[PDB]
């Protein structure tokens, strides 16, 4: 979970507790999140 | 006047004419048109788009206009190319040409008993894409677009990513294809067909390594399973005129036996370092067509059953098992290859990969099957159906009116 | 000229394959 | 039910960028 | 350069 893109940077997607993406999201979907 | 030993001989006359009567009646499919085995596609694509002419369609033709067309089956896979694999855009194109002429020759000729292999097998346990820096499936095995490809040098480095299909039918127990990549530019393509433990088949193989996109080993095979290493004589007939047929020219050996498929190669089994784009097609079409001739062999194989009566059936079951068993460790036994392309992902992990996916064998574990073979008489009762008695009033009425008015 | 007709053949079919998939899995397998 | 259409067809495509683009960030 | 329309595979022929 930490290997992945930017990861402790701004730039990262927001994270859940466990360090999954918020709304389960990954880096291949159609859409971008928002940071928070 | 005819002696115990005659009757016997006359016995042993039958017995291997009617091998040879069934061999020759396989070997005669293929033995007019070689070239249909490959340029079925173009031959499908030449035939071109069929009218769909059933009475929903003519129905909706009729009415609004819009035309339902269909297709042949190796346009329609054609058309899918790869299809929805997950690694289908970061593969090589012959890599991607031999996975979509394959998988479109399983799913057009083995139709209405392929079968997805049972997913607590392979799928369950997240086999079905391996990631070399997501091993213990973390990221939902979204790790092939979730994490950048590692740098040059950096922990990780190169990359190993592994996508697999595996599929069932009623003549073959386990038909797998392997995709393997690196960044160092190496692809690995492994596509084995195994028949299962009652038939008197072969091991249909095949192995694409390349490095930076250049072709250095290609092998096709027809493994046997036999206790002498030597195939039926429709094998042999179908192998030797294909190799005449799509090889051509090349040099005549293009063997070098490498120490490890002696035991598991058959006399026409092919292993080539490919050496020009022209031998590189020659080959590609060389084993499309043996694939294609391996699964429209199996469509008429019939199981070897044993038990009571007899106990020759029972001694070829078990060189059935044996000649299986003695594939799947001659293949276990590679570790002075492929198997350096693990170890990335572990070694506990390679042989948990390496025994049960790939080469496994057991006696006592048959994956099931669903042969339908009632989606045949679905479509031709919607090509052809029959609209009732009070249609046929009808259509009696019309015919008299056509008759009656012109 | 027909590789736009396959590129669009392609996109219709797997949206009709994958809408149907869809609600067979939730209408049926739950 | 609304969107496994779109989604089959973004799980079924091919990405164009490979095969377009030839040979810092390279 | 229209896309879409022509290339993008591998073939023997």
Same mark, same amino acid.
């Given at each position: &979970?930490?290997?992945?893109?930017?990861?402790?940077?701004?730039?990262?997607?927001? &994270?859940?507790?466990?360090?999954?993406?918020?709304?389960?999201?990954?880096?291949?979907?159609?859409?971008?999140?928002?940071?928070? | 006047? %005819?002696?115990?030993?005659?009757?016997?001989?006359?016995?042993?006359?039958?017995?291997?004419?009617?091998?040879?009567?069934?061999?020759?009646?396989?070997?005669?499919? =293929?033995?007019?048109?070689?070239?249909?085995?490959?340029?079925?596609?173009?031959? +499908?694509? +030449?035939?071109?788009?069929?009218?769909?002419?059933?009475?929903?369609?003519? *129905?909706?033709?009729?009415?609004?206009?819009?035309?339902?067309?269909?297709?042949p089956a190796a346009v329609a896979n054609?058309?899918?190319?790869?299809?929805?694999?997950? *690694?289908?855009?970061?593969?090589?194109?012959?890599?991607?040409?031999?996975? +979509?002429?394959?998988?479109?020759?399983?799913?057009?000729?083995?139709?209405?008993?392929?079968?997805?292999?049972?997913?607590?097998?392979?799928?369950?346990?997240?086999?079905? %894409?391996?990631?070399?820096?997501?091993?213990?499936?973390?990221?939902?095995? =979204?790790?092939?677009?979730?994490?950048?490809?590692?740098?040059?040098?950096?922990?990780?480095?190169?990359?190993?990513? %592994?996508?697999?299909?595996?599929?069932?039918?009623?003549? =073959?127990?386990?038909?797998?294809?392997?995709?393997?990549?690196?960044?160092?530019?190496?692809?690995?393509?492994?596509?084995?067909?195994?028949?299962?433990?009652?038939?008197?088949?072969?091991?249909?193989?095949?192995?694409?390594?390349?490095?930076?996109? $250049?072709?250095?080993?290609?092998?096709?095979?027809?493994?046997?399973?036999?206790?002498?290493?030597?195939?039926?004589?429709?094998?042999?007939?179908?192998?030797?005129?294909?190799? $005449?047929?799509?090889?051509?020219?090349?040099?005549?050996?293009?063997?070098?036996?490498?120490?490890?498929?002696?035991?598991?190669?058959?006399?026409?089994?092919?292993?080539?370092?490919?050496?020009?784009?022209?031998?590189?097609?020659? =080959?590609?079409?060389?084993?499309?067509?043996?694939?294609?001739?391996?699964?429209?062999?199996?469509?008429?194989?019939?199981?070897?059953?044993?038990?009571?009566?007899?106990?020759?059936? +029972?001694?070829?079951?078990?060189?059935?098992?044996?000649?299986?068993?003695?594939?799947?460790?001659?293949?276990?036994?590679?570790?002075?290859?492929?198997?350096?392309?693990?170890?990335?992902?572990?070694?506990?992990?390679?042989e948990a990969y390496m025994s049960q996916?790939?080469?496994?064998?057991?006696?006592?574990?048959?994956?099931?099957?669903?042969?339908?073979?009632?989606?045949? %008489?679905?479509?031709?009762?919607?090509?052809?159906?029959?609209?009732?008695?009070?249609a046929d009033e009808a259509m009696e009425?019309?015919?008299?009116?056509?008759?009656?008015?012109? | 000229?027909?590789?736009?007709?396959?590129?669009?053949?392609?996109?219709?079919?797997?949206?009709?394959?994958?809408?149907?998939?869809?609600?067979?899995?939730?209408?049926?397998?739950? | 039910?609304?969107?496994?259409?779109?989604?089959?067809?973004?799980?079924?495509?091919?990405?164009?960028?490979?095969?377009?683009?030839?040979?810092?960030?390279? | 350069?229209?896309?879409?329309?022509?290339?993008?595979?591998?073939?023997?022929?």
């Open positions: &979970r930490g290997k992945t893109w930017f990861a402790g940077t701004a730039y990262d997607a927001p &994270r859940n507790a466990d360090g999954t993406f918020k709304h389960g999201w990954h880096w291949n979907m159609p859409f971008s999140v928002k940071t928070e | 006047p %005819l002696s115990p030993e005659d009757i016997m001989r006359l016995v042993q006359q039958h017995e291997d004419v009617a091998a040879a009567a069934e061999s020759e009646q396989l070997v005669a499919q =293929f033995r007019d048109d070689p070239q249909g085995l490959y340029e079925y596609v173009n031959r +499908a694509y +030449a035939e071109g788009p069929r009218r769909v002419t059933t009475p929903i369609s003519l *129905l909706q033709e009729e009415i609004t206009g819009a035309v339902t067309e269909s297709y054609d058309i899918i190319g790869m299809g929805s694999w997950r *690694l289908k855009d970061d593969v090589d194109p012959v890599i991607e040409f031999l996975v +979509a002429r394959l998988e479109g020759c399983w799913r057009e000729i083995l139709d209405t008993d392929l079968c997805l292999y049972p997913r607590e097998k392979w799928k369950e346990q997240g086999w079905d %894409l391996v990631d070399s820096m997501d091993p213990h499936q973390e990221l939902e095995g =979204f790790s092939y677009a979730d994490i950048p490809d590692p740098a040059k040098g950096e922990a990780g480095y190169p990359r190993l990513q %592994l996508e697999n299909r595996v599929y069932c039918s009623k003549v =073959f127990r386990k038909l797998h294809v392997e995709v393997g990549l690196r960044q160092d530019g190496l692809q690995v393509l492994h596509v084995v067909v195994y028949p299962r433990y009652s038939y008197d088949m072969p091991i249909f193989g095949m192995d694409i390594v390349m490095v930076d996109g $250049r072709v250095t080993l290609a092998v096709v095979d027809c493994c046997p399973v036999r206790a002498d290493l030597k195939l039926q004589p429709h094998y042999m007939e179908t192998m030797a005129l294909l190799q $005449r047929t799509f090889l051509e020219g090349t040099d005549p050996a293009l063997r070098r036996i490498p120490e490890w498929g002696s035991k598991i190669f058959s006399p026409l089994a092919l292993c080539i370092t490919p050496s020009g784009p022209e031998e590189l097609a020659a =080959f590609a079409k060389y084993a499309v067509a043996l694939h294609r001739a391996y699964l429209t062999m199996s469509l008429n194989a019939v199981p070897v059953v044993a038990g009571p009566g007899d106990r020759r059936e +029972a001694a070829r079951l078990q060189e059935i098992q044996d000649g299986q068993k003695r594939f799947c460790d001659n293949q276990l036994v590679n570790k002075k290859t492929r198997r350096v392309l693990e170890v990335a992902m572990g070694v506990e992990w390679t996916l790939m080469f496994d064998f057991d006696p006592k574990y048959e994956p099931p099957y669903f042969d339908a073979s009632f989606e045949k %008489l679905y479509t031709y009762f919607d090509e052809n159906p029959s609209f009732g008695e009070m009425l019309e015919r008299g009116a056509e008759a009656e008015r012109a | 000229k027909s590789f736009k007709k396959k590129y669009k053949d392609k996109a219709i079919i797997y949206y009709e394959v994958g809408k149907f998939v869809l609600n067979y899995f939730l209408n049926n397998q739950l | 039910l609304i969107f496994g259409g779109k989604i089959s067809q973004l799980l079924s495509s091919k990405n164009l960028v490979k095969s377009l683009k030839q040979a810092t960030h390279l | 350069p229209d896309p879409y329309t022509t290339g993008f595979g591998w073939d023997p022929d």
